[PDB]
Amino acid sequence: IIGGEFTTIENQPWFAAIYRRHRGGSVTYVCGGSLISPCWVISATHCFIDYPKKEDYIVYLGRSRLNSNTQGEMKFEVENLILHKDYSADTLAYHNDIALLKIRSKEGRCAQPSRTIQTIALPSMYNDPQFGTSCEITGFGKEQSTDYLYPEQLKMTVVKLISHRECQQPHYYGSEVTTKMLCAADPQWKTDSCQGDSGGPLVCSLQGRMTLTGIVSWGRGCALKDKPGVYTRVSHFLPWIRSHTK
C-alpha cells in the first residue's frame, strides 16, 4: 500500500495473509485474500498460477504483522485451490483474475469469528457502488514501487471508484481495462495498492454494510498519475463463486 496508514487486523478482520513454503523450508509472502465464509478465502489467480500446488500454501487469519505472530491469529492449510479456468494475462492486464482457497486447519476446522476474524459480505450480482464512492484497500504490499522489502505492519488506505469512461481513456489504460474490472484511485494520485497487495480486498459500503467490491489485480506502477489501481469486479463473478462454495 502506497501512502495510507498502518492499521491492525481489527479494522479489516476479513483480511487473509497468504504465504508459500519453499523446499529449504523458507516461507515467503505471496498475496492477500479475503474471508467470504468460514471455509473460503477469495484472492487473485495470478498470485498462484505459476505454482498451483495447494500443499505449498499457508493462509493466516487475524494477522496484523507480516513476519511475526499476532495474538489470536489462526493458521490454515489449503484444502482446495480453485483457479479460474479462463484466467489469462495480457501485456498489462489480467483477466478473470480470481481464485478461491478452501481453508482447513490441521485440526480439521474452518475459521471461527472473533475480534480479529470476520467474514466480508459479497455484493449482489452486477451491483456496484456509484463512481466517486470511497472504498478501503488493505495489504502487506510495497510502500513504494521501487522498494525491495514489504512492510512489517499491515496497511490500509482509501481510494475512490473511477468510471470506466475515465479509466478507458487512452492516457489512462485505454483498451486494457474491461467491464469485468473496476478502477480506483486517489484523486491526487498519492495513495494506491502495489506489488504484494494483489488478491486483497477493495471494500465499499453498499446498502448498509461493508462489502467486497473488488480484488486487487494490477496497475502500471504504483500511485502513478493517470494510472489507477485495477480490481477484479466481484459483482460479475457470483455464479462462479457460488458454484464452488456450494
Ligand X SMILES: N=C(N)NC(=O)c1nc(-c2ccco2)c(N2CCCCCC2)nc1N
Close Cβ partners of 236 (under 8 Å, ≥ 6 residues apart): 125, 126, 179, 180
Are residues 15 and 32 in contact, defined by beta-carbon separation less than 8 angstroms? yes
201 burial type by CB count under 10 A (0-12 exposed, 13-18 middle, 19+ buried): buried
In Å, what is the CA distance from 106 to each residue of 59, 72, 73, 79, 109? Answer: 12, 16, 14, 10, 7
- Interface residue with ligand X among 4, 13, 129, 229 (CB under 6 A) is 229
Tell me the residue number closest to ligand X, measured at CB: 219
- Interface residue with ligand X among 222, 232, 235, 236 (CB under 6 A) is 222
Are residues 97 and 43 in contact, defined by beta-carbon separation less than 8 angstroms? no
Site string for ligand X, 185-214 (x = CB under 6 A): -------xxxx-xx----------------
Work out the number of other CB atoms within 10 angstroms of the CB of residue 226: 13
Are residues 58 and 29 in contact, defined by beta-carbon separation less than 8 angstroms? no
Residue count, binding to ligand X (CB under 6 A): 14
CB of 226 to ligand X, least distance (A): 11
Q: Which is nearer to ligand X, 127 or 145 (CB)?
A: 145
Give the helix/strand (H/E) hosting 218: strand 209-218
Asked if 219 interacts with ligand X (CB under 6 A), we say yes
CB of 218 to ligand X, least distance (A): 5
The interface region with ligand X, picked from 97-105, 116-124, 202-210, 221-229 by CB under 6 A, is: 221-229
The set of catalytic residues is 46, 97, 198
Q: Which is nearer to ligand X, 14 or 218 (CB)?
A: 218
With the C-alpha atoms ordered 11, 43, 26, 56, is the resulting torsion angle positive or negative?
positive
Beta bridge partners of 28: 20
Q: Which is nearer to ligand X, 39 or 154 (CB)?
A: 154
CB of 95 to ligand X, least distance (A): 14
CB of 84 to ligand X, least distance (A): 16
Q: Which is nearer to ligand X, 37 or 195 (CB)?
A: 195
What are the two backbone dihedrals, phi and then psi, of residue 233, each rounded to the nearest 5 degrees?
-80, 95
Residues forming contacts to ligand X in the complex (CB under 6 A) are 145, 192-195, 197-198, 216, 218-219, 221-222, 227, 229
